[PDB]
Amino acid sequence: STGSATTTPIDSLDDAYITPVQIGTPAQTLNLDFDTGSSDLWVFSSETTASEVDGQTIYTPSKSTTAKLLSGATWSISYGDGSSSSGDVYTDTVSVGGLTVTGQAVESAKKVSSSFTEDSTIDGLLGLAFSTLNTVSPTQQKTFFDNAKASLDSPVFTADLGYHAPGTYNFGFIDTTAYTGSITYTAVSTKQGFWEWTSTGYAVGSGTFKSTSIDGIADTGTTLLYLPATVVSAYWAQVSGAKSSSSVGGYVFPCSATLPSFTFGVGSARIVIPGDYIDFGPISTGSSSCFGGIQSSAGIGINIFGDVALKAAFVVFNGATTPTLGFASK
Numbered sequence: 106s107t108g109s110a111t112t113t114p115i116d117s118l119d120d121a122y123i124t125p126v127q128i129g130t131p132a133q134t135l136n137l138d139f140d141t142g143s144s145d146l147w148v149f150s151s152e153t154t155a156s157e158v159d160g161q162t163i164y165t166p167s168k169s170t171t172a173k174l175l176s177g178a179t180w181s182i183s184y185g186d187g188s189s190s191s192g193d194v195y196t197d198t199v200s201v202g203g204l205t206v207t208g209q210a211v212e213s214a215k216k217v218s219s220s221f222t223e224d225s226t227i228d229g230l231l232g233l234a235f236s237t238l239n240t241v242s243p244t245q246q247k248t249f250f251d252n253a254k255a256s257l258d259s260p261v262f263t264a265d266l267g268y269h270a271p272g273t274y275n276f277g278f279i280d281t282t283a284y285t286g287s288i289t290y291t292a293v294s295t296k297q298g299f300w301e302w303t304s305t306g307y308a309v310g311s312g313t314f315k316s317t318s319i320d321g322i323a324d325t326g327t328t329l330l331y332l333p334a335t336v337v338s339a340y341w342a343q344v345s346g347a348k349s350s351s352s353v354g355g356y357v358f359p360c361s362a363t364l365p366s367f368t369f370g371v372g373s374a375r376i377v378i379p380g381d382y383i384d385f386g387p388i389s390t391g392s393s394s395c396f397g398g399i400q401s402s403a404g405i406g407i408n409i410f411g412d413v414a415l416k417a418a419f420v421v422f423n424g425a426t427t428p429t430l431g432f433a434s435k
Contacts, residue, residue, distance in 0.1 A: 106256045107277035108204025112139065112266065115226040118385055119412060120328050122266060123226060124274055127200040128211055129169030135162050135228035139274055140326030141264070141300055141422065142409075144238035144248050145182050146199070147190055147212035148229035149221075157217050160225030164213065171207075172197045180212045180240045185327070185405060190217040194241055199249060201231075204276050206253050210239075210246035230326070233262065233422065238298035250276070250424060260424045264325055265435070266416040268382055284419035284433035289374035293428045297407075299324070300422060302430050304410075305372060307332075309340050310365030314375070321408030323415060323422070323430055329385070330367070330378070331402035331409040340367055340399050347397070353388050356397040360387060367399060369414060371432040378417040 112122040123136035128148065135148055149158060151165040166172035172195045181191035192215035199209040214229070221227065232239070236247045254260045257277030265283055266272040273283070294301045299322040306316040319332065337356065341347040343365050347358035358364070364380030383398035398413040421431030 106204055106253070107258055107275070108200075108202035108253075109273060109275045110202030111271050112274055113271045114267070114269065115224070117269070119266075119269060119416065121227060122272070122325070122412070123228075124201070124231070126231060128164050129166070129197050130171040131169075132200070133162075133164055133169065135164060136226065137229045137231040138227050138326055139231050139233055139264075140324070141233040142322060142324035142326045143182065143184065143230060144232040144234045144236055144298065145180060145212050145240055146210065146229070146231045146249055147180065147182070147192070147214055149217070150192070150213040152192060153214045154216055157222045159222050162228045164211065164229075166195045166197065166211075166213065169197055172211075175210065175241075175244075178210075178241050178244060178246075180242070182240045185409075186220070188218045188220045190214045190221060192216065194246070201249065201276065202274065204253055204257075206249055209249055209252055210241060212241065233325070234300065235295050235298045237295070253277075254424055262422050262424070264415060264420045264422065266325070266412055268379075268416050272416070279421060284435045286434055287374075288419070288421055288431040288433040289371045290421070290423070290429045290431045291371055293430055295428060299407075300428070300430055305370030307336055307370065308368040308375075309343050310380075312343075314368065314370070316370075319369075319408055321402075321410050323410050323420060325412065325415060327409045327411030328398075328413070329409075329411050330399045330413040331405055331411065332399065333408065334401045334403045337399055337401045340365070341397065349401075353394070353396070355400045357388060357394045358397055360393045360395040362395075369410075374432065376414070376418045376432055376434060378414060382413055382417060
């Protein structure tokens with residue numbers, strides 16, 4: 106089997122991408138944030154504290170003839186950005202882009218943190234990291250991809266995120282029309298439960314490529330590119346007037362600037378992030394200070410190849426017995 110679904114930016118900055126997911130019978134379609142950095146499929150629901158729902162579409166298990174309470178199971182998650190959610194668990198039928206899993210754990214939120222409430226466009230998350238990170242207790246549950254894997258034509262999924270435009274998540278096949286050149290594959294460590302890999306270096310604009318190993322995770326659920334402070338300083342030094350602002354929370358730059366590109370290495374291959382992809386707009390409405398899309402990972406504890414990086418590539422998440430990642434230009 107295969108599946109294919111379009112993923113759409115939630116706003117004009119590509120702050121996140123939402124993909125429609127069918128849950129239950131009859132289907133209830135919720136728009137979920139597909140997150141290769143976590144492993145829970147959780148949704149706003151009829152059980153979510155009412156004051157914490159503000160415009161989201163909710164899953165109502167009592168209206169699904171295939172929903173079954175997973176007796177005794179609870180979940181609770183905290184994300185790298187300080188947000189969190191928790192609740193109980195049902196199993197139900199879940200379909201993405203024509204690919205159906207029966208008996209998928211659907212984690213129903215009883216509580217969500219304020220950042221989720223305040224974002225009316227995201228109805229939940231669909232985790233695509235390794236199932237070892239799933240938070241359900243006392244019986245850990247499998248991700249959608251893990252449940253689907255054995256049925257797929259090939260045990261892979263691909264992320265093809267758009268710049269200021271929709272993109273595609275495919276399951277079970279590699280669309281050879283969706284990229285240019287060849288796909289370069291690179292080793293993955295699953296020791297932390299993430300799609301963790303080692304970039305071979307970077308360049309700023311037209312500058313020379315610096316060969317250096319940069320360990321990090323491929324994370325579709327993180328907006329920006331978070332790299333070591335040395336690398337990030339080298340980037341912003343090429344933008345007149347750019348500086349790190351402690352009060353804003355990162356590097357800012359004059360909105361009048363033209364940003365240079367940023368290149369990262371995948372083996373001997375190179376992925377080029379155009380400068381425009383690094384512009385996240387005014388820090389507040391009407392400001393002439395703009396927020397940068399490349400930020401320091403110091404204090405986060407891991408480097409993160411988030412959407413800024415991934416949207417410059419066609420990315421293969423190869424879930425074979427020994428997982429690997431593939432990157433192609435597009």
